[PDB]
Amino acid sequence: RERDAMVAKTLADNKKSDEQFAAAQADYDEAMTEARVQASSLRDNARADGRKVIEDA
Amino acid sequence: MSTFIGQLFGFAVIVYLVWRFIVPLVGRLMSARQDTVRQQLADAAAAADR
């Protein structure tokens, strides 16, 4: 029983390891695209109120 | 006390026959199984550290 549980745990460990490996790049890209969409949120609000002050002045 | 000697020669030839033919194959079989389970444990530890 222990040896069969061991081989099953080894298979599951390999699978979960490769899955977490892929999830590494997945969440890295997710975080950096959240970051760049936050960045692109700025530089437009700045452009927005710049346009507002240019026109009101 | 001479049947003892004849049977003993019979036992000698039968143990020679087994040590010649049978014990090599069963040794190979148990060694193959030993090395198989060894490799299993090794790659188990490998997948764990991976």
Side-chain angles (χ1 to χ4, degrees), chain B residues 1 3 5 10 12 25 28 31-33 37-38 42-43 47-49:
Chain B
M1 280 267 300
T3 72
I5 311 304
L25 287 93
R28 292 210 294 102
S31 179
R33 269 194 281 194
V37 72
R38 180 181 182 180
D43 78 4
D49 73 31

Side-chain angles (χ1 to χ4, degrees), chain B residues 19-39:
Chain B
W19 270 76
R20 178 172 173 181
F21 286 87
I22 294 306
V23 70
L25 287 93
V26 296
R28 292 210 294 102
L29 179 56
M30 71 168 309
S31 179
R33 269 194 281 194
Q34 268 176 339
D35 285 329
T36 290
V37 72
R38 180 181 182 180
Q39 183 273 343

Side-chain angles (χ1 to χ4, degrees), chain A residues 2-29:
Chain A
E2 274 178 41
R3 193 159 71 227
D4 291 358
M6 176 268 284
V7 75
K9 155 194 175 183
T10 295
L11 197 145
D13 274 21
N14 273 335
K15 180 256 292 178
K16 203 201 301 177
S17 69
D18 189 18
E19 172 266 357
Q20 201 188 14
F21 198 93
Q25 292 89 18
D27 205 287
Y28 157 84
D29 299 327

Side-chain angles (χ1 to χ4, degrees), chain A residues 21-41:
Chain A
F21 198 93
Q25 292 89 18
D27 205 287
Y28 157 84
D29 299 327
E30 147 73 24
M32 72 178 290
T33 196
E34 268 282 321
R36 93 193 166 203
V37 75
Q38 178 64 25
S40 178
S41 177

